Amino acid sequence: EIKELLKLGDLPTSGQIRLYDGRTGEQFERPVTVGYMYMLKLNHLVDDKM
Amino acid sequence: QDVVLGLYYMTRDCVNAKGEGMVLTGPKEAERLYRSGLASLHARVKVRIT
Amino acid sequence: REEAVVWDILDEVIREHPVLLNRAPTLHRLGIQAFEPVLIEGKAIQLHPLV
Amino acid sequence: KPLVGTGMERAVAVDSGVTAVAKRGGVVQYVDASRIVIKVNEDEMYPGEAGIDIYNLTKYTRSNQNTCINQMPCVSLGEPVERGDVLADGPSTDLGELAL
Amino acid sequence: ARVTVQDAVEKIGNRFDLVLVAARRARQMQVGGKDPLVPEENDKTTVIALREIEEGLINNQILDVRERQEQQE
Amino acid sequence: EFLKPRLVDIEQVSSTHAKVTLEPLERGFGHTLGNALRRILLSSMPGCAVTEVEIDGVLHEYSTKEGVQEDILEILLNLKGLAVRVQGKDEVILTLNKSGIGPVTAADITHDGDVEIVKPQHVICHLTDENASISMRIKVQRGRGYVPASTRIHSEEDERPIGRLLVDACYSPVERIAYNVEAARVEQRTDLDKLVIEMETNGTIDPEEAIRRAATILAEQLEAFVDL
Amino acid sequence: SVTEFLKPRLVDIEQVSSTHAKVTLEPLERGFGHTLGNALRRILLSSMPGCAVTEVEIDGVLHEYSTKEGVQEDILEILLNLKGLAVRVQGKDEVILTLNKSGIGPVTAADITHDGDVEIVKPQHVICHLTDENASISMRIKVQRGRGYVPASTRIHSEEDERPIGRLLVDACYSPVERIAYNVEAARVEQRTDLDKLVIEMETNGTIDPEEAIRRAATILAEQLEAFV
Known part of the structure; x- marks a missing residue:
């Protein structure tokens, strides 16, 4: 079902894209995984720990 | 972990990559070929090493 | 007040002065090592990856 | 909101209390970052005691872990609302979904 | 500049006598005058002690000798 | 004996983002200038x-x-x-x-x-x-x-x-930059490239003016290697 | 105050024998370390007459x-x-x-x-x-x-x-060069800290020394840009 949904979008089936390095501008070998992951902050903050 | 992966990837060999079996005159221009992008990072090659 | 002379003073009093880093459940005698400091922005101790 | 949830956000955020679940479905008369004033539909009202509903939101105040508990009106003026429905986003609620 | 003390240990076989000799010499430099015997690169007295040790021109023998000499003087 | 690019056009595809085009380039300067300009344009713009x-x-x-x-x-x-x-x-x-x-x-x-x-x-x-x-x-x-x-x-x-x-x-006005190098078209000669930049924008900065100011910055920086 | 950058003040040119030179520039604006390093690397290493x-x-x-x-x-x-x-x-x-x-x-x-x-x-x-x-x-x-x-x-x-x-x-x-490998390490001005420090390190086969190596690379790129500005 995920493959089918991606393919509804215009995105590659494997879910892996080619990416270009920001510094040297030359391609990466071996396409990598991108996507949107839902991330969280945690109340363990450096300025309350230091 | 990251470095051992980087090495295990940097020192290996697939069968038919770019620059297969062309002779090189030393580690310096080995690096120079890989950086210019005329030979995949790992294709087997005869080099003069000292 | 942190007037801008103390930072040069502090560089000179750090230059060659080891400090001991420790990690909480210390087990074997590598649980305490020394390092020379290098002043950083931010608020996190940076640690070489081979340690 | 989280792109990829498990549907339980609705129940959690509605029944956690942080939001202001409207009681008698009506038509929103007045929105304002402090309070929300709802007109009640007619057939959902008592003979006397007629009036209208008022929800006093709770603006920036203190939690027990020092994070800032807060509420924001999500419905815009002149808009139907039905019984058992959200009006105010609490802390970490997006349109009545648990968005941490 | 100093990173490893291995040469110092090579010229003082103990690696603890290293600590003792070096500290004694460093006090000589820091408390009572006695300019170093190596061109200091603004390294501190501690590194200068370990460095003179690496030059093989300080060890417990020389320290005892020169202390006795000056004290007679 | 190299060649030098120009600004062959500034295709204004919308109100925000446009597509400048450079031509011609030598084999390699495509990616070189492409990456240099992307990195500048994202960093330093008024x-x-x-x-x-x-x-x-x-x-x-x-x-x-x-x-x-x-x-x-x-x-x-x-x-x-x-x-x-x-x-x-x-x-x-x-x-x-x-x-x-x-x-x-x-x-x-x-x-x-x-x-x-x-x-x-x-x-x-x-x-x-x-x-x-x-x-x-x-x-x-x-x-x-x-x-x-x-x-x-x-x-x-x-x-x-x-x-x-x-x-x-x-x-900062710029929002997204991309570039593609592709096959060029010049006098009976192949092996020349065409760089195609593509810059999202708030709308404040003209595309041509942006690319030109970035080139100026980078030339000013290189005025220090050329002398030692 | 808006088109007014920093330019490399001190320029070390510390050289091993006669072809293994080592150049350090500082300070460069935050994020030019890599852009200049990569520009000169690619030019020197792929296109040098x-x-x-x-x-x-x-x-x-x-x-x-x-x-x-x-x-x-x-x-x-x-x-x-x-x-x-x-x-x-x-x-x-x-x-x-x-x-x-x-x-x-x-x-x-x-x-x-x-x-x-x-x-x-x-x-x-x-x-x-x-x-x-x-x-x-x-x-x-x-x-x-x-x-x-x-x-x-x-x-x-x-x-x-x-x-x-x-x-x-x-x-x-x-091309004369045989090895170019920039680096980037944090350098500081009396107030700022997030700045950059370029360390080019370079050898040439001998026909010309690292100096004219880098000078020619800078000149090539400076002309390609002379097109616009």
């Missing part, structure tokens, strides 16, 4: 983002001015995302005044000649009462990069009145 | 998988040794050279004919070793002025004719 905001009847950036359906803080963010162009001075004080039910577009700001708003559909806040009114003074200035309020807040000791809310500056 | 050996034809060799007695090296090893040779050429565009020599003992670069304008940089170099009275070496080496790095990638069949048997090909390395 913007005009808002810096200080002062609503008339608000003490600090956490209260709720009566009559408007958004916290002063959310109004303040919606300002932080404003897009405006100034020409003469390095700083200006725009003024907003509004009263009555209805939205508050950005176009309601007074339109001083040296200031050009660039998106009159941009919404700051919604008023939600007949006789409710807001009025604010918004200080907008030039800049470069990203400058948080926590830095400027230690940049001047002379007292600041209680009431000047400080937004974070975002002095 | 140079002069190098291209093809070689031995007197009595028809193919790589052959040999010639007296020579303790092989065809392959001498082809490497001739990659390593480093020639500079005056106003000649391309030029052929001859390398006749016999005698029991090594053959060095100085044994090459000099041919007027063409100049060698390491008369001390080594090509092959001979050990037999009657054995000799007779190759027609060929140098050409080029603009990059050219392997022998599929060229025995590229040319639309058959080149005569004996045309051994050599991977041409035109």
Whole structure:
């Protein structure tokens, strides 16, 4: 079902894209995984720990 | 972990990559070929090493 | 007040002065090592990856 | 909101209390970052005691872990609302979904 | 500049006598005058002690000798 | 004996983003200049983002001015995302005044000649009462990069009145850059390339002017390697 | 205050012997370390006008998988040794050279004919070793002025004719440089800290020293940009 949904979008089936390095501008070998992951902050903050 | 992966990837060999079996005159221009992008990072090659 | 002379003073009093880093459940005698400091922005101790 | 949830956000955020679940479905008369004033539909009202509903939101105040508990009106003026429905986003609620 | 003390240990076989000799010499430099015997690169007295040790021109023998000499003087 | 590129066109595909084109290039300078210009253009461009905001009847950036359906803080963010162009001075004080039910577009700001708003559909806040009114003074200035309020807040000791809310500056017009090198077309000769840049924008900076200022910056930097 | 950057103040030029130089610049604006490092790296390493050996034809060799007695090296090893040779050429565009020599003992670069304008940089170099009275070496080496790095990638069949048997090909390395590897390390001004410090480290085969190496690279790129500004 995920493959089918991606393919509804215009995105590659494997879910892996080619990416270009920001510094040297030359391609990466071996396409990598991108996507949107839902991330969280945690109340363990450096300025309350230091 | 990251470095051992980087090495295990940097020192290996697939069968038919770019620059297969062309002779090189030393580690310096080995690096120079890989950086210019005329030979995949790992294709087997005869080099003069000292 | 942190007037801008103390930072040069502090560089000179750090230059060659080891400090001991420790990690909480210390087990074997590598649980305490020394390092020379290098002043950083931010608020996190940076640690070489081979340690 | 989280792109990829498990549907339980609705129940959690509605029944956690942080939001202001409207009681008698009506038509929103007045929105304002402090309070929300709802007109009640007619057939959902008592003979006397007629009036209208008022929800006093709770603006920036203190939690027990020092994070800032807060509420924001999500419905815009002149808009139907039905019984058992959200009006105010609490802390970490997006349109009545648990968005941490 | 100093990173490893291995040469110092090579010229003082103990690696603890290293600590003792070096500290004694460093006090000589820091408390009572006695300019170093190596061109200091603004390294501190501690590194200068370990460095003179690496030059093989300080060890417990020389320290005892020169202390006795000056004290007679 | 190399060749030198030019600006063969500046295709304005929309109001925000365009597509400049360079031609011709040598084998390799495609990627070289492409990456160099991308990196410059993202880093260093003069913007005009808002810096200080002062609503008339608000003490600090956490209260709720009566009559408007958004916290002063959310109004303040919606300002932080404003897009405006100034020409003469390095700083200006725009003024907003509004009263009555209805939205508050950005176009309601007074339109001083040296200031050009660039998106009159941009919404700051919604008023939600007949006789409710807001009025604010918004200080907008030039800049470069990203400058948080926590830095400027230690940049001047002379007292600041209680009431000047400080937004974070975002002095940067470009938003997304990409480039493709592809097959060129020149006099009976292959092995020349064409670089195609593509730059999203707030709308403030012309594409040609952007690419030209980036080239200028990089030439100024290289004026130090060429001499040793 | 808006078009007013920093420019590298101190310029170390600390050099190991005569080709392994090491340059440090600081401070560069936050994020020019990599842009200049990469620009000069790619330019120096892919496009630098140079002069190098291209093809070689031995007197009595028809193919790589052959040999010639007296020579303790092989065809392959001498082809490497001739990659390593480093020639500079005056106003000649391309030029052929001859390398006749016999005698029991090594053959060095100085044994090459000099041919007027063409100049060698390491008369001390080594090509092959001979050990037999009657054995000799007779190759027609060929140098050409080029603009990059050219392997022998599929060229025995590229040319639309058959080149005569004996045309051994050599991977041409035109550009002078042999190694460039920038780095980036945090440098600080009396207030800021997030700045950059470039450390170029570079060797050249000998025809020209690191200085004119970097100067020419900067000049090439400066002209390509002179187009716009």
